[PDB]
Amino acid sequence: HSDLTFCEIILMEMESHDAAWPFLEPVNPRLVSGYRRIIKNPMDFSTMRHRLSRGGYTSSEEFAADALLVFDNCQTFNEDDSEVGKAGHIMRRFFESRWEEFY
Protein backbone atom coordinates (compact mmCIF):
# COMPACT_ATOMS: atom_id res chain seq x y z
CA HIS A 1 0.00 0.00 0.00
CA SER A 2 0.93 3.64 -0.44
CA ASP A 3 0.30 3.98 3.33
CA LEU A 4 3.80 2.62 3.92
CA THR A 5 5.65 4.96 1.55
CA PHE A 6 7.43 6.55 4.50
CA CYS A 7 8.81 3.15 5.45
CA GLU A 8 10.11 2.67 1.89
CA ILE A 9 11.90 5.99 2.36
CA ILE A 10 13.35 5.05 5.75
CA LEU A 11 14.58 1.76 4.28
CA MET A 12 16.19 3.58 1.34
CA GLU A 13 17.92 5.96 3.71
CA MET A 14 19.20 2.95 5.65
CA GLU A 15 20.38 1.13 2.47
CA SER A 16 22.33 4.23 1.40
CA HIS A 17 23.83 4.88 4.83
CA ASP A 18 27.59 4.68 5.22
CA ALA A 19 27.22 2.07 8.02
CA ALA A 20 24.72 -0.09 6.12
CA TRP A 21 27.21 -2.37 4.33
CA PRO A 22 26.85 -5.37 6.71
CA PHE A 23 23.04 -5.41 6.46
CA LEU A 24 22.26 -5.15 2.76
CA GLU A 25 21.89 -8.89 2.05
CA PRO A 26 21.35 -12.04 4.12
CA VAL A 27 24.43 -13.23 5.98
CA ASN A 28 25.93 -16.09 4.01
CA PRO A 29 26.34 -19.28 6.07
CA ARG A 30 29.16 -20.33 3.77
CA LEU A 31 31.13 -17.31 5.00
CA VAL A 32 30.02 -16.97 8.63
CA SER A 33 30.31 -20.33 10.35
CA GLY A 34 27.24 -21.22 12.39
CA TYR A 35 25.51 -17.88 11.83
CA ARG A 36 22.05 -19.37 11.11
CA ARG A 37 22.60 -21.83 13.98
CA ILE A 38 23.19 -18.97 16.44
CA ILE A 39 20.68 -16.51 14.90
CA LYS A 40 17.27 -18.17 14.65
CA ASN A 41 15.59 -15.37 12.68
CA PRO A 42 18.04 -13.70 10.29
CA MET A 43 16.99 -10.40 8.81
CA ASP A 44 18.45 -7.87 6.38
CA PHE A 45 17.44 -4.82 4.36
CA SER A 46 16.95 -6.64 1.02
CA THR A 47 14.57 -9.09 2.64
CA MET A 48 12.69 -6.11 4.08
CA ARG A 49 12.75 -4.35 0.73
CA HIS A 50 11.25 -7.36 -1.00
CA ARG A 51 8.54 -7.66 1.63
CA LEU A 52 7.59 -4.00 1.17
CA SER A 53 7.72 -4.32 -2.62
CA ARG A 54 5.14 -7.13 -2.61
CA GLY A 55 2.96 -5.41 -0.02
CA GLY A 56 3.77 -8.05 2.58
CA TYR A 57 3.81 -5.79 5.65
CA THR A 58 0.48 -5.49 7.40
CA SER A 59 1.63 -2.51 9.44
CA SER A 60 4.47 -0.11 10.00
CA GLU A 61 5.04 -1.74 13.40
CA GLU A 62 5.88 -5.00 11.58
CA PHE A 63 8.44 -3.13 9.48
CA ALA A 64 10.03 -1.59 12.57
CA ALA A 65 10.21 -5.02 14.24
CA ASP A 66 12.20 -6.30 11.27
CA ALA A 67 14.56 -3.32 11.45
CA LEU A 68 15.21 -3.88 15.14
CA LEU A 69 15.72 -7.57 14.42
CA VAL A 70 18.58 -6.69 12.09
CA PHE A 71 20.28 -4.79 14.90
CA ASP A 72 19.42 -7.29 17.67
CA ASN A 73 20.89 -10.08 15.55
CA CYS A 74 24.03 -7.98 14.96
CA GLN A 75 24.44 -7.32 18.70
CA THR A 76 23.88 -11.03 19.44
CA PHE A 77 26.58 -12.24 17.05
CA ASN A 78 29.24 -9.52 16.91
CA GLU A 79 31.49 -7.77 19.42
CA ASP A 80 30.79 -4.11 20.16
CA ASP A 81 34.25 -3.02 18.97
CA SER A 82 34.16 -5.11 15.80
CA GLU A 83 33.48 -3.40 12.50
CA VAL A 84 30.09 -5.04 12.00
CA GLY A 85 29.25 -4.52 15.68
CA LYS A 86 30.09 -0.82 15.44
CA ALA A 87 27.95 -0.49 12.30
CA GLY A 88 24.93 -2.08 13.97
CA HIS A 89 24.97 0.41 16.86
CA ILE A 90 25.26 3.29 14.38
CA MET A 91 22.40 1.95 12.29
CA ARG A 92 20.10 1.29 15.27
CA ARG A 93 20.31 4.93 16.35
CA PHE A 94 19.82 6.09 12.77
CA PHE A 95 16.69 3.99 12.44
CA GLU A 96 15.42 5.11 15.83
CA SER A 97 15.97 8.77 14.96
CA ARG A 98 14.00 8.45 11.74
CA TRP A 99 11.19 6.50 13.39
CA GLU A 100 10.92 9.15 16.12
CA GLU A 101 10.14 11.72 13.39
CA PHE A 102 6.75 9.98 12.94
CA TYR A 103 6.20 8.49 16.41
Ligand X SMILES: CC(=O)c1c(C)[nH]c(-c2csc(CN3C(=O)CNC3=O)n2)c1C
Instruction: Write out the residues near ligand X by the rule CB under 6 A.
Output: 21-23, 27, 32, 35, 74, 77-78, 84
In the complex, minimum distance from the CB of residue 69 to ligand X, in angstroms, rounded to a whole number: 11
Nearest distance in Å: CB 8, ligand X: 22
Amino acid identity, residue 61?
E
Contact, 51 vs 57, CB < 8 A?
yes
Of the two residues 20 and 64, which places its CB atom closer to ligand X in the complex? Answer: 20
User: String of b and e for 74-94 (b: at least 16 CB within 10 Å)?
Assistant: beebbeeeeebbbbbeebbeb
Q: Which is nearer to ligand X, 12 or 21 (CB)?
A: 21
